[PDB]
Structure formats: C-alpha cells, structure tokens
Design a protein around this nucleic acid. Structure first.
Ligand code: NA
Ligand code: NA
Length: 327
DNA sequence: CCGACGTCGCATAAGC
DNA sequence: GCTGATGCGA
DNA sequence: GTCGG
C-alpha cells in the first residue's frame, strides 16, 4: 500500500491520537487511534466507507463514523476545531520536546508558555532533560540514515571493546532488522561477570569512554543499568556538522541478555506473534526470560539461554534472521 | 456492562 | 533527611 | 475507542 491510498484517513487518526495523549491525557484512546491508523495503513484498497473500514480489527463504530464524514466532506469538524484552538494546539506542540509530556505542557501553556521561543526565555523553569530536548528539538525529529548508524555502531563497538574486550554489545531496534533509517540508537550491553544471581561500574565506564572520545555529548538520565543520552558523529573536516542523535545504553545480566536482544530487536508485531506461539507450546516469554508453564499456568524457573536461537529451539521455531522479523 | 489496554529505570515531586 | 508517587520515555 | 469475557 502507498500513501495516497488512505493517507488522509491515517493522518486524521494519528492527529486525533496525539490530542488524546497530549491534551486529553487518555493514553488508551491514543493507542486505539494509532492501532486503527496502523491497520488502515496496511489495508491494500482505497476505503469507500466507514462500514468497509469497520471490518478491520481496531476500527469500531466511532472511527467508522469519523471516516464517513471525512469521505463526504474532506475533513472533521472536531479535528478542525481543536486544530485552531490556541490552548490545545500549543499543549500538543510542546510535547514534541523530549522531557515535556502532557502534564508539563499543560502547566506551561497554563502560564502563557506556548512556544519554543517562550521555552527559551524560561530556562529556569525547565529540568535538565527538557533543556536538552529544547536544545536539540530539530535534530531529535530527524531520522538517522543507516550509513550514519553504521558509523555510530563502529564507534560504540570499538570503544566498548577498548574498555574491556569481554564486553558484549549489540545495536538492536529496527537497525538490526536492516532498516534503511532509524529514530535513535539502542545499545544492549552485557559482561560475563554480570548475572542475575550476582561491579556497579560496568555501565559507567562505557559511558565514560564514549564521552571522553567526545561521541556522547549530553546525558538525559543515567543509573547503574540504564543510560539515556545524546551523541554525535565527528564532523568530516570542513563539511557540515552531523545532527545530534538520541542513544540509549542498557546493561543486562548475561543470563538475560539474549531475551533482551530478541525483545528489543522487534518488531513489536513479531514479538507479539512469537510470545503467542510460545504460550501455545507451554512457555512464557518476556523481555527478561523464558519460563515453562505449568500444567495449570504456574510458571517454572527461567530456562538457560545462551543465544537468540536457544529461545527459538525451546518453542520449536526455526531461527529467523532479524531481517525477516517484521511479523 | 465493564475492565484491559506493557512495563519499568531514572529524575523529580511531594509528603512525612 | 528518607520513601513512595508521579512524570516521562521506551 | 475498541475489544471481549
Ligand atoms: Na473492527
Ligand atoms: Na515530549
């Protein structure tokens, strides 16, 4: 399917989704509209009516109604109205700043703070995260070409090995599935000395080395197991600077690493199907472990996992490359 | 009819 | 001061 | 908002 097939409907639903999350603060309506937009974006026909669309799982009576009015008039009275509402459109916009959620955006607009300009004049009202999000507003909304991701991966793997050659690092997400672009970099980290039944400095030393070679530029959050921050590729001589990128790094126990790598490689539709096929076979898979059920649903101890393939073996599936993990 | 809708690490607030 | 709740992102 | 027990 292509854009001009049902793009008007999906953009409409996505827009409605954002106002639910950011303004009405109804996260489940937000996910409902998104789910509806997703199943429509994949539907290989130009939708003629709300009734036709209601067949798809995720599209109910109200969205069917809203599709009918769009097809007949080319717009939605409610969407048009909230679009021009100065208060609501500002709350919705401010949430595009990383660190500014629905609650913060509401507070800012409550006291006349509506724009990036307003945010820039009111730095003392921003926490550390929001300042970084403000500083890199444009960059954070840019996607990352795979070639740059490869160059980013090169640096991460190199410095990680340089700190301790026994570290194991894996860049997951859509990148590992071979996507041509990425929204951010998701790095999963482990070490043989770190298990579940067992230094608290393993993550810090890696972050430290990446900051020191000036790859990591900023820190959003950082604990003993999870790092969230900003990075940037070195500028190729005289040429234009690279955009600042979002990078996450997590330290996972060795015995939970490949369950983690599997989960955060995705896709989410693939994960869903996989942990659906697994209950069938008497196993429960989460992001950490795989456990056996249990003649009455009582989960047993986590099974030993030493690779992604090990998980597939447990539930009698053949190993499927990250490339072929869209569903 | 009515509850589910993912879950959790980290920063920060909020109350004690 | 310490702790649980909340906000946020993923 | 949608699904389903
Ligand atoms: Na439906
Ligand atoms: Na935000």
């Amino acid at each position: 399917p292509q854009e001009t097939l049902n793009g008007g409907i999906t953009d409409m639903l996505t827009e409605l989704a954002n106002f639910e999350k950011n303004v009405s603060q109804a996260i489940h309506k937000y996910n409902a509209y998104r789910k509806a937009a997703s199943v429509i974006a994949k539907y290989p026909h130009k939708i003629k009516s709300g009734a036709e669309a209601k067949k798809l799982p995720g599209v109910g009576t109200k969205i069917a109604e809203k599709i009918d009015e769009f097809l007949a008039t080319g717009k939605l009275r409610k969407l048009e109205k909230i679009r021009q509402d100065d208060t609501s459109s500002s709350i919705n916009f401010l949430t595009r700043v990383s660190g500014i959620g629905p609650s913060a955006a509401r507070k800012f607009v409550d006291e006349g703070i509506k724009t990036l300009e307003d945010l820039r004049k009111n730095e003392d009202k921003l926490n550390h995260h929001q300042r970084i999000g403000l500083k890199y507003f444009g960059d954070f909304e840019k996607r990352i070409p795979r070639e740059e991701m490869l160059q980013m991966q090169d640096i991460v793997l190199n410095e990680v090995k340089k700190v301790d050659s026994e570290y194991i690092a894996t860049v997951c997400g859509s990148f590992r599935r071979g996507a041509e672009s990425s929204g951010d970099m998701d790095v999963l980290l482990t070490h043989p000395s770190f298990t579940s039944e067992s230094q608290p400095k393993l993550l810090h030393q890696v972050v430290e080395q990446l900051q020191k070679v000036h790859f990591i530029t900023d820190t959003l959050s950082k604990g003993e197991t999870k790092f969230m921050g900003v990075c940037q590729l070195p500028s190729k001589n005289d040429e234009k600077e690279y955009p600042h990128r979002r990078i996450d790094i997590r330290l996972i126990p060795k015995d939970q690493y490949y369950c983690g790598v599997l989960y955060f490689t995705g896709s989410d539709i693939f994960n869903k199907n996989m942990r659906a096929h697994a209950l069938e076979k008497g196993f429960t898979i989460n992001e950490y472990t795989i456990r056996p059920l249990g003649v009455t649903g009582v989960a047993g101890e986590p099974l030993p996992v030493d690779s992604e393939k090990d998980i597939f073996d447990y539930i009698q599936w053949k190993y499927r490359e990250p490339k072929d993990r869209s569903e």
